[PDB]
């Protein structure tokens, strides 16, 4: 494509031609981009000496690490922030209203959701994207404080969606690295849920064994210490956890796998609960 898309229509139009050619669900593709359009505007927040202030995380982490056919599919935008909430919503709402490659975006209000092991209780708000003047999507954002070292460093990541629909612009999006995503996903996936609600996250089983995956040999002492950091600073279960399956998990595992047929993961959650629990052991012996 010779020039970026004159409007909306053709936005939609040029990604329902990439969709198709990439073998892609357009409504997977068209949240990828909004995803990329808004962590576009969280790169621009930086501090006096040109590092990040977001770090993207979670399920929007692993798409941009293993592309759109090799990762689970959700919808939340994670990011782990390096200053205070309302200072980063108004740098966030204030990239919005400047826009990038036409894309405007205009945010809610955050808001305080409860938290047991965070003295700075997360927030969440969303962002309603334009394109050229024309409502384009709105994708859920939620932004937490930093945790030990989980901020210390950050991956680059990088996609081409944008430039597939003629938006030439170059995307590098600032991640958290992997051996902090293993060790809050694996605090969570072990989480005893006070009585009213019950820890529905069979979905970090599957994203455990693909970060696993792309740690490949590397060294587990990094990631010991992001789990032995995060577990301690929680002060709730401690460390090595137990991999517990609930008996609604089975299902909410299998959905959970929807897509990744042709990837080697175990394809029942409790063989996965065991993969993820000789992941940990392994982890926890290192030197
Ligand atoms: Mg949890
Ligand atoms: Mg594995
Ligand atoms: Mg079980």
């Not at 930093?146 to 999006?173: I, K, M, R």
């Not at 992997?178 to 599957?206: C, F, G, M, S, Y």
């Amino acid at each position: 494509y010779s020039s970026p898309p004159t409007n909306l229509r053709s936005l939609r139009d040029r990604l329902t031609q990439v969709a198709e050619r990439q073998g892609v669900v357009f409504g997977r593709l068209q949240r990828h981009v909004a995803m990329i359009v808004v962590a576009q505007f969280a790169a621009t927040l930086t501090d006096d000496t040109g590092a990040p202030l977001l770090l993207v995380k979670g399920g929007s982490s692993l798409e941009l690490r293993r592309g759109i056919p090799d990762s689970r599919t959700s919808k939340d935008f994670d990011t782990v922030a390096r200053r205070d909430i309302e200072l980063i919503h108004e740098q966030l709402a204030d990239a919005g209203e400047t826009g990038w490659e036409g894309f405007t975006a205009i945010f809610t209000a955050p808001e305080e959701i409860d938290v047991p092991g965070m003295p700075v209780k997360p927030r969440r708000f969303t962002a309603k994207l334009s394109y050229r003047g024309r409502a384009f999507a709105t994708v859920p954002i939620q932004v937490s404080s930093v945790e030990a070292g989980n901020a210390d460093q950050f991956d680059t990541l990088t996609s081409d969606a944008l430039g597939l629909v003629g938006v030439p612009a170059a995307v590098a999006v600032p991640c958290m690295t992997i051996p902090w995503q293993i060790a809050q996903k694996l605090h969570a996936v072990t989480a005893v849920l006070e009585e009213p609600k019950v820890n529905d996250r069979a979905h970090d089983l599957v994203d455990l064994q693909l970060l696993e995956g792309l740690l490949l040999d590397a060294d587990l002492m990094p990631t010991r210490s992001a789990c032995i950091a995060i577990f301690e600073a929680r002060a709730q279960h401690p460390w090595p956890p137990r991999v517990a399956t609930l008996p609604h998990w089975p299902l909410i595992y299998a959905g959970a796998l929807e897509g990744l047929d042709h990837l080697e993961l175990a394809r029942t959650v409790d063989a996965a609960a065991q993969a993820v629990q000789r992941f940990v052991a392994r982890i926890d012996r290192a030197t």
